[PDB]
Ligand binder design. Sequence first.
Ligand code: GTP
Ligand code: ACP
Ligand code: GDP
Ligand code: WJ7
Ligand code: CA
Ligand code: CA
Ligand code: CA
Ligand code: MG
Ligand code: MG
Ligand code: MG
Lengths: 54, 347, 438, 425
Amino acid sequence: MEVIELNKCTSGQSFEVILKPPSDPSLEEIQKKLEAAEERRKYQEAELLKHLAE
Amino acid sequence: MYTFVVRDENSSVYAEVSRLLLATGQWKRLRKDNPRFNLMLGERNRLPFGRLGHEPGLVQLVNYYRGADKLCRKASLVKLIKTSPELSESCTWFPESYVIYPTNLTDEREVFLAAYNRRREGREGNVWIAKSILISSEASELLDFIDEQGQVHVIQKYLEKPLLLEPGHRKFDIRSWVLVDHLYNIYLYREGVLRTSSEPYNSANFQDKTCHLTNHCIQKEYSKNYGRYEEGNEMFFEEFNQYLMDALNTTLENSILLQIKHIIRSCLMCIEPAISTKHLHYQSFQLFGFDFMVDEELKVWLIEVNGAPACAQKLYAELCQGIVDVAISSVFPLAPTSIFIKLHHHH
Amino acid sequence: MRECISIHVGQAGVQIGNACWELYCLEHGIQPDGQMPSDKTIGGGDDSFNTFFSETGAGKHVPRAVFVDLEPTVIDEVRTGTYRQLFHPEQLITGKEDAANNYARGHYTIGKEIIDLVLDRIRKLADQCTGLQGFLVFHSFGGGTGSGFTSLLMERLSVDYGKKSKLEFSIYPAPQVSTAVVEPYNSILTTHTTLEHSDCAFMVDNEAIYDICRRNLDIERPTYTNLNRLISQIVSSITASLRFDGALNVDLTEFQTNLVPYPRIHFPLATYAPVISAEKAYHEQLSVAEITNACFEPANQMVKCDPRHGKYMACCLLYRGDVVPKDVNAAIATIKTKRSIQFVDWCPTGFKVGINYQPPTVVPGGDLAKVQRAVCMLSNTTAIAEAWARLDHKFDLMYAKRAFVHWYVGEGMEEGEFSEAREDMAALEKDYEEVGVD
Amino acid sequence: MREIVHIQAGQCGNQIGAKFWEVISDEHGIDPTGSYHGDSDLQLERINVYYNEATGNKYVPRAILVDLEPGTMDSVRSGPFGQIFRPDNFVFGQSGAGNNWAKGHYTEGAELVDSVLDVVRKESESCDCLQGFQLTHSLGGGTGSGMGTLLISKIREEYPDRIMNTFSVMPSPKVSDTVVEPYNATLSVHQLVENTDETYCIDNEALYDICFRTLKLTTPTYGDLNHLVSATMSGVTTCLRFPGQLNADLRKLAVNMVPFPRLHFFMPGFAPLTSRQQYRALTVPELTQQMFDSKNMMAACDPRHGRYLTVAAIFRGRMSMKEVDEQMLNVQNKNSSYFVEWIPNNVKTAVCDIPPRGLKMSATFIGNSTAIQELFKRISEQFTAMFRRKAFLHWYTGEGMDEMEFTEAESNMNDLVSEYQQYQD
Ligand SMILES: Nc1nc2c(ncn2[C@@H]2O[C@H](COP(=O)(O)OP(=O)(O)OP(=O)(O)O)[C@@H](O)[C@H]2O)c(=O)[nH]1
Ligand SMILES: Nc1ncnc2c1ncn2[C@@H]1O[C@H](COP(=O)(O)OP(=O)(O)CP(=O)(O)O)[C@@H](O)[C@H]1O
Ligand SMILES: Nc1nc2c(ncn2[C@@H]2O[C@H](COP(=O)(O)OP(=O)(O)O)[C@@H](O)[C@H]2O)c(=O)[nH]1
Ligand SMILES: CN(C)C(=O)c1ccc(F)cc1Br
Ligand SMILES: [Ca+2]
Ligand SMILES: [Ca+2]
Ligand SMILES: [Ca+2]
Ligand SMILES: [Mg+2]
Ligand SMILES: [Mg+2]
Ligand SMILES: [Mg+2]
């Protein structure tokens, strides 16, 4: 039961107590993910319109 | 209209409970994966406790205390007793035991040898038993037998002076069923059993394990006197109580029952702050089977604790109905002379 | 002095942000008009509250916050609310139609056409910081904007602000206050694409905030107002060290150091007490030992679980009020002899403790009562994995039948990103079990 | 500002729609001339969802009245609120549809469709942000069925990313105008499967049995059936017309109710249903026992014959919200065998403070139930009973159709029945 690193200031104080010792995607790659899904929405809507034309 | 689910088809006890619940016309069974349940009869291993108590408007109840395996595991029980101050290492009702890991994997190998070399030096009885079965008086054979396996084992003192019933000169054990409800009241079933051995006890031959092991499956398989003295090697408290009065001039209550009720308390009270569901989002309750040994001095020792025990055929009806009264109906009341003995304590 | 920029995404993020900045103002003595009488440096200064508030020559104290919603109804409450004068219009960003509780819609369809705008508004708040620490991100799991747009914003913040830290205040979905069925999907989608981008995440399960309101505050059916005023209390306690003089958790970097030794396991459990009803006749004030002993009750945890069957990796105790170290240590001793606190064998069994003498501030007319002392415990327990288990289980139940899956594929997302996301959670759950169970 | 565009087509379509605007117009404090005279700001909060604001504080519904004969729409213009509808929004012909789907979809209707879309486009162009469309119509007639679905097919072409919502009246031999109603309905159902996000099925037989058995009406009339649809339409739209964050958007609602693109046919229900013992206050438990009861459902389907994929409830009135949750959780927990267990929490409840006209409190039921397959089974059975003999086919082949297209409509709806069947297990 030890108390170390006791810091005291006007608004409070903090300390530590030890009971026991121990024993990314770049900018290019995100714009591609976004533009890839946008392309699958376009292809799905094109196939929808193609269906409506028929 | 209460609802429950079943996730353990192999449980002979709760199989009866499920039958009695439906016989009340007030309980409905659901599929084993439907989460809208009041009561769960969960699987033995890897029960999904983390998913309980999260269904709004439902007060859920389960039949296994999370973390009770600390008490119902061979190596766990030993570790619990020697570490918990409530039990201390100097506990007088638990055989001197040691946890021994196989050499192909803490471990109390050297601690066991010291207490072993002390006994062989003092001319005392030095017969130990390994389990997780082998009985031997040589430290070389006990350890060598554990290395041939691959799981944790426990070596504890073998009671060389067990109490022997007469006629017969045979060993035996005592099984007591204890039920713990959601309020952590410790109810002890008024009816126990003695799974007796139909073979005379012989202390000069630990090679034949038919007279030393009192298990119901070993007596009904490797014993040639099964069912001779009592039906199914199961003498109940009435007969065993009459025997104690005729031969030893004492009662089952005073000689053995007091020690049993004390052991059950010290074990369950010990872990209460660890498994209690008093402020949990769900509620727990579990049925336990304590296995006790009695020596020729009428001292009770604790062998192991079963977390998924079975019941004697004759006592299925009386007990299962009692599980519905104090554990289930006390939470989901329906629209005596209790068959239990409450063991009061300080929570 | 280093600045902290707060980002509120979606309805839940915005309303909660509205209750925190309301609370920040009452604490630092800031009025609705942004004026601060106690600040003697007019339009300048590097005080501890300047980490969250910038100043104008006219003396206005402007939060370092940015609010983002794909629909204007919720943010419009801010533009006309009590604290309308605090923010300028740039800080409030609103769209025209939301994501309909569809992660794919907030991330891909709608997110792509608004992402560059948010960054630009954030870049403006960064251009005022002399040493930006990082960002505090408030959002929900279930909402399509809070889940879908957040993961995208997180990906982009790791690109524009690489060395900067990023903390989350996430809202776990609870059926008692939600009308969306697909919130598991969104929760598991966002947690996958956000994991490697958040340094520390505080999950608040609505189920926990809900029952804490009903049980302690005697609110039969709590509203979001009730939930948010409580949630902002926890937030205030966790961010206090950044806004006040002190030596513990003095910047966002100290949160990862003191709370997350393993990166993927960056979800500390929060516990708070006491929560006392204001309508009570008058309550007996709890001591240090009694409120500390309460931090180990499942009843006042932000996520309902059983820490007794887990293993702690770190632990902080933030005290606010009439508290002194002598009392803190005393309670800890007594608790170790009673409770079950199992640490991992590769971490010390210690407690970092901070104390702020100012007691917790309460919103006039709110639901909470004024207490003389209170504590908030941040403990990294493997027991929080229970939340992931429940959530993952629900995910499996629907995905097995591909239920609702078409709404996500219809917005451009690939069905594979579902399993790929779910496999990441399966890995997250295993890392917890490898560290907790024996 | 999330605007909806209403469209009613045909005899049934317009009379029902007409009463619909009569019912909600009363709730929003709008008089037959367009002026507001309510007393609560809640009435105007979401007023621009179904109404347009003209000059002088006038509120003009955002509705388009469509029909191929002038008869029915002349009645609306001279009905109670007829003066309130925009004059230009009356688009009608003179040929009539003769209760023929082919005429409404290919010949007569095709000549008038372009001009109806000219008005829809004019309403959308003014919308700050359009949620989607909602269409009232019947399926057994020729105009609202044949031309109605034609409008949907063309609306989805011009607005492919908007929600298409419909209140469809299913024909029943017990309430039958012509014997070709199964033909007409079977042909529309395929269109709704493809081009609608949500369709509130309303079986006229259920409406009849409700008026005869529950409401004790000796001789029911179309007007009586329409009263129910009004009260039901006013109900399901409460989420959208008042300050409620439970199911705000049409897309949000669709996202929470439709787990699969084709199974979007809902069973609506209403409570209370009391005969003139009408002044009795109705407790929350009673509202919930009736709301789920089949005799309060308007699809003529027995939910206990199938399973619920999703369920939305709406409670209107000053009541105990805690008591609402309790009773809703009670219904689920007492009959969890009829809710699929592979969709967690598929029952959501919304509360609204403003009750309908003349009720201390009421509830509206919206159910995506696999039992709806019983409805499509009756239709497909009546369709086949005739199509096997080619009976009455000339009315259609004479309009340019082939027996092939009939065989496909048949097979397309037998597939819909099979789809509802694999998910009921
Ligand atoms: N604690 C709390 N939770 C909230 C609040 N608002 C919404 N939620 C929760 O957030 C979840 C839904 O997420 P939302 O924030 O509404 O979604 P969104 O960010 O607006 O995104 P959209 O889908 O586009 O509307 C539900 O589970 C709600 O319980 C709030 O103010 N406080
Ligand atoms: N230290 C000891 N002294 C005397 N007998 C012992 C003993 N340890 C074990 N036994 C014998 O072993 C039997 C119990 O074995 P144990 O319980 O360890 O195995 P097990 O768990 O597979 C049987 P069960 O679970 O049904 O009680 C008893 O009949 C007892 O006689
Ligand atoms: N509920 C209801 N159903 C109607 C009404 N009028 C007609 N129907 C039903 O609609 C079908 C006839 O469709 P109809 O509207 O006449 O076709 P239209 O030519 O497009 O107008 C029949 O099955 C009728 O039962 C009405 O006022 N109310
Ligand atoms: C011709 N016909 C269907 C009707 O006049 C009618 C209308 C409504 C109703 F409920 C019952 C009947 Br019958
Ligand atoms: Ca200053
Ligand atoms: Ca980073
Ligand atoms: Ca012509
Ligand atoms: Mg055993
Ligand atoms: Mg929203
Ligand atoms: Mg007609």
